[PDB]
Structures are given as C-alpha cells and as structure tokens.
Amino acid sequence: KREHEREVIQKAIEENNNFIKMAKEKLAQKMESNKENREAHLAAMLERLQEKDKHAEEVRKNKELKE
Amino acid sequence: REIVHIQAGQCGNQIGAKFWEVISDEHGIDPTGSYHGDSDLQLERINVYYNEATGNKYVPRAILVDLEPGTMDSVRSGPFGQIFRPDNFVFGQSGAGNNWAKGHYTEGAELVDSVLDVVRKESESCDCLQGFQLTHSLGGGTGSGMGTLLISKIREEYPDRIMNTFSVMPSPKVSDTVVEPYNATLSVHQLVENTDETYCIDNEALYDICFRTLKLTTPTYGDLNHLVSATMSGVTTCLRFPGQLNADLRKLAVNMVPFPRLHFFMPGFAPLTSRGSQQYRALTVPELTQQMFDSKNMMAACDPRHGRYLTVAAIFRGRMSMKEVDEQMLNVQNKNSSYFVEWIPNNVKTAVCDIPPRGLKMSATFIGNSTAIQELFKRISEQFTAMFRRKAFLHWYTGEGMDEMEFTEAESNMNDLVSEYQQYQDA
Numbered sequence: 001k002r003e004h005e006r007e008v009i010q011k012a013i014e015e016n017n018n019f020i021k022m023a024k025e026k027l028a029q030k031m032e033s034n035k036e037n038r039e040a041h042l043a044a045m046l047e048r049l050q051e052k053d054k055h056a057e058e059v060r061k062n063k064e065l066k067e
Numbered sequence: 068r069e070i071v072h073i074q075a076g077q078c079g080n081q082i083g084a085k086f087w088e089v090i091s092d093e094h095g096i097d098p099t100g101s102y103h104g105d106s107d108l109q110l111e112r113i114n115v116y117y118n119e120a121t122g123n124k125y126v127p128r129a130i131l132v133d134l135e136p137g138t139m140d141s142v143r144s145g146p147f148g149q150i151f152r153p154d155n156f157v158f159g160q161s162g163a164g165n166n167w168a169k170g171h172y173t174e175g176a177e178l179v180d181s182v183l184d185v186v187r188k189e190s191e192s193c194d195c196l197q198g199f200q201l202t203h204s205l206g207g208g209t210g211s212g213m214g215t216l217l218i219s220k221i222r223e224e225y226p227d228r229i230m231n232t233f234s235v236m237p238s239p240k241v242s243d244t245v246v247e248p249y250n251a252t253l254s255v256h257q258l259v260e261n262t263d264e265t266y267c268i269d270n271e272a273l274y275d276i277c278f279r280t281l282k283l284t285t286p287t288y289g290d291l292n293h294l295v296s297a298t299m300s301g302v303t304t305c306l307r308f309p310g311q312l313n314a315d316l317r318k319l320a321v322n323m324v325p326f327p328r329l330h331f332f333m334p335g336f337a338p339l340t341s342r343g344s345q346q347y348r349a350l351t352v353p354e355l356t357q358q359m360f361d362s363k364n365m366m367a368a369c370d371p372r373h374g375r376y377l378t379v380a381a382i383f384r385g386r387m388s389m390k391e392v393d394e395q396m397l398n399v400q401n402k403n404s405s406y407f408v409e410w411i412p413n414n415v416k417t418a419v420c421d422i423p424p425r426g427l428k429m430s431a432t433f434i435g436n437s438t439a440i441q442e443l444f445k446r447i448s449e450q451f452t453a454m455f456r457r458k459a460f461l462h463w464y465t466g467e468g469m470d471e472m473e474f475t476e477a478e479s480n481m482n483d484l485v486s487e488y489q490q491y492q493d494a
C-alpha cells in the first residue's frame with residue numbers, strides 16, 4: 001500500500017507537469033507560426049508594392065526611349 | 068489500559084469535542100483540567116482516556132487532526148477547548164475539498180507523519196496501550212481519506228493493538244456534496260480491512276430521529292451531535308467505569324466480531340432526548356429495554372427486523388434492579404428469539420453501571436452486530452454506482468493521481484461485504 005501511495009502522488013505530479021509542459025509548447029508553437037505568417041503576408045505586400053516601382057522605372061524609361 | 072483518541076476533519080473534531088465535554092463532565096473534570104467530583108468510581112478508570120499532569124491535572128489522550136485550521140480553532144475556543152494538550156493540534160492549511168484522494172494521497176500524506184509523531188509520543192507514555200479510537204466522517208476528505216490513511220499507518224506501527232472507530236456515514240438528508248458516496252465507499256474499503264470495531268453512525272438515522280421522534284423540524288449538526296455524544300458516552304461506559312466485567316477494547320472485539328470483516332456495529336440509545344429540554348419521568352427498566360431495541364432508537368438507519376443479530380451488547384446506566392434488568396433482557400430475547408442467530412449461543416450480554424449520564428436517571432446503550440447493517444452499505448453502494456456508471460465527478464479524483472480501477476475495487480469489496488452479511492442472515 002505504501003508503494004501504491006507514492007505511485008499515486010507521483011502520477012498527480014507527472015500529470016500536472018505534463019499539462020504545464022504541453023501548454024508551454026502549444027503556445028510557443030502558435031506564437032512562432034503566427035509570427036512567420038504575419039511576416040509572410042507583409043513581405044508579400046511589400047514585394048508587390050516594390051514591383052510597382054520596377055514598373056514605374058520601366059514606364060519612365062519608355063518615355064525617353066520614345067523621344 | 069490507555070486508549071489513544073484521534074479526531075480528524077470537520078465532523079470528527081466536532082463530535083470529538085462533544086465526546087470530551089460529555090465524558091469530562093461524567094468524570095468530574097472541569098475545562099481547566101482539575102477534578103471536582105464526589106464519587107471515586109469517577110477516578111478509578113480515569114487513565115483509560117486521561118493523562119495525569121503535574122499539579123494533579125487531567126489532560127485528554129487526544130490528538131486533534133485537520134488539513135484546515137477552521138474547526139480546530141473552534142475547538143480551541145470552545146468550552147473545554149483549553150483542556151487539550153496544545154502540542155496535539157496537528158493541522159495543515161490547504162484543506163481537502165471534500166475529496167478522499169486529497170486526504171489520503173496528496174494533502175493528507177504531507178501531514179500524516181507529524182500526526183504519527185504525536186501518536187508515538189502519546190503511546191510511549193502508556194503502561195499497557197489497548198489501542199486507538201478515531202472519530203471521523205466518511206463523506207468529506209480529511210476524516211475520510213486522511214483518517215483512513217492514519218489507520219493504515221497506525222496498524223503498520225502497532226499491528227497488535229485494537230483499532231476502533233466512530234464513523235459518520237453520509238446521507239442525502241444531511242449532505243454537503245454530491246461526492247459523499249464516492250468518499251464513503253473508498254473509506255468503507257479501508258475500514259473493512261483495518262479496523263477491529265467501527266460504530267456506524269448514520270447521519271440518515273440521526274436526522275430521522277431528530278425530525279420524527281424529537282419533533283425538530285430543522286435539525287442541525289448540533290442536534291445530530293447531541294445524539295452522537297450520548298451514544299459515544301454510552302458505548303464507552305464499560306471502558307471508563309468499573310464493573311463485574313473488566314472491560315477493554317479487545318474483549319469487546321472478541322465477543323462482538325465472529326468473522327473479521329463483520330465488525331460494523333449498529334448503536335442505539337434510550338431514552339431519546341433533545342438538547343436543552345429535559346423530561347422528568349425516568350424510564351422504567353421495561354421501557355429502556357423496549358426502546359433500545361426499537362428501530363427508532365438505532366443510530367444506523369437499518370431495520371433490525373430485516374436482519375439477524377449475530378451479537379449484542381447492552382449497557383444500562385443508573386440506580387436500578389439488576390434482577391429486573393436480567394428479567395427484561397431475557398424477556399426480549401425469548402420473545403423475539405428468531406431475530407438472534409441460533410448458532411451463536413447466548414449472544415446477548417448486559418452490563419449495569421451505577422453512574423447515569425448527565426440529566427437522566429436511567430439510560431440504556433445498545434450495540435448490535437446485525438446482518439441488517441447491509442442495508443446501510445447497499446444504500447451507499449446504489450448512490451455510488453448511479454454516478455460511477457457515468458464516471459460523473461471522477462475528474463476531481465483522477466486529478467489527484469487516482470485511477471478508475473481503484474473505485475471498481477472499493478465498490479466490489481463493499482458489495483462482497485453485503486453478500487457476506489446475507490450469507491449469515493440465512494445461515
């Protein structure tokens with residue numbers, strides 16, 4: 001009965017720890033995936049605004065080429 | 068023949084404190100520990116329950132245990148709260164949340180060793196220690212879970228001393244939480260293995276006695292505990308005063324328990340008195356005998372006519388005719404002899420002690436080992452399986468490391484105990 005008593009309390013400890021651990025890792029996983037995502041949507045927004053500038057060079061280059 | 072008393076959790080310490088009030092008044096000890104009595108029967112067996120201190124003071128051999136400080140500050144403030152040895156208040160701060168697993172495995176385990184330290188210091192001052200009596204309920208977490216943890220550890224340290232308990236059974240009529248049937252079933256599993264004698268004190272019966280017989284429309288724990296302390300005083304009369312018998316806990320177990328697991332006693336008391344209001348006609352010996360066998364005077368809500376008496380102890384208190392007591396006791400047997408098992412000859416034993424309890428001239432305490440007690444365990448078993456078949460409320464217990472399996476084992480042990488009682492009621 002003593003060994004059973006220490007197993008039960010070891011199990012409660014082991015379960016509280018595993019819950020804290022998994023919440024800790026679930027969160028760091030979410031915060032990392034969310035940062036990547038937010039950064040990728042911004043980088044794609046800048047990438048195509050910067051294409052607008054390459055096309056604005058191309059258009060000013062034509063007005064001299066044609067004159 | 069010293070007895071070591073332990074009281075655990077809210078219920079155990081509330082009925083514990085009343086017990087020491089009642090018997091202290093009987094032995095003529097005051098709330099400061101000084102004896103102010105007239106007779107010497109009061110002091111001949113005072114050491115069964117009291118240690119003697121320098122200054123010729125008397126200090127209960129009582130250890131007060133809780134996982135919460137609440138009730139125990141109440142005891143220490145109560146009338147006789149100062150009589151208790153202060154080193155013997157052993158308490159934590161977290162409480163047990165009416166949760167057997169907290170009392171037995173997590174919170175209680177933190178505190179149990181310091182309780183065993185006090186128990187050890189008490190035992191080592193004993194010429195001839197009989198054993199232990201525990202007051203506790205089975206429905207909360209401390210008295211239930213930690214109380215049965217203590218018993219399991221006391222038996223490991225003192226395997227050859229007697230283990231005696233007063234165990235308050237839960238009832239929906241006086242109910243604190245829905246999980247009482249779980250805590251009580253887990254506790255009965257422990258009691259069946261590790262006690263020699265347990266007085267089953269059914270909050271269901273104390274309620275019905277208060278409501279029907281005492282005409283109290285709204286019973287409180289105060290009304291219930293008045294009944295409990297009168298019973299506790301009655302059943303321990305033979306330990307605390309001298310008789311033709313030199314009575315102790317082991318002789319009681321030897322004569323009351325024909326099979327080791329069947330050690331759950333039905334207590335009864337007569338006359339049934341409400342607190343405060345006294346009545347002025349003493350009962351007659353015929354009346355005591357009839358009431359104390361009346362199901363209405365039983366503290367376990369079980370019908371004795373639905374079972375059979377394996378053994379019976381009867382203790383009459385007051386100035387009365389021993390001839391007439393013998394006559395009335397022989398009359399109740401020979402008139403209803405079918406309710407006594409024929410294969411234990413002469414299974415009824417009666418004692419008389421001169422000193423009555425406070426405020427009565429005549430009283431009778433009944434201790435029955437009846438196969439009808441299975442009704443109590445059936446009741447609790449049905450309430451247990453109603454929830455357990457849906458695993459309801461288990462998370463409170465699995466959160467403390469317990470497995471469903473351990474509930475299945477405890478339920479199944481309690482159902483075996485029921486079947487073992489039915490074996491001998493047909494025998």
Ligand SMILES: Cc1ccc(-c2[nH]nc3c2[C@@H](c2ccccc2)N(c2ccc(O)cc2)C3=O)cc1
Pocket residue numbers: 302303304305306312313314315316318319322323378379380381382413414415416417418
């Ligand atoms: C069928 C039967 C029942 C009991 C006994 C017997 N034999 N010795 C002792 C007993 C009990 C007892 C029961 C009633 C009257 C007087 C003694 N008892 C006792 C001990 C402590 C108590 O708190 C209360 C009672 C003894 O000490 C023999 C047969």
Ligand SMILES: Nc1nc2c(ncn2[C@@H]2O[C@H](COP(=O)(O)OP(=O)(O)O)[C@@H](O)[C@H]2O)c(=O)[nH]1
Pocket residue numbers: 075076077078079081082163164165166203204205206207208209210211235237238241242243244247270273288289291292295
């Ligand atoms: N007769 C009686 N029963 C009580 C008393 N206090 C609590 N109980 C019962 O005990 C159960 C609660 O368990 P409790 O002992 O209070 O929890 P604990 O503090 O962990 O020991 C409830 O079902 C009540 O019916 C009391 O003063 N008298």
Ligand SMILES: [Mg+2]
Pocket residue numbers: 077165207243
């Ligand atoms: Mg409570």
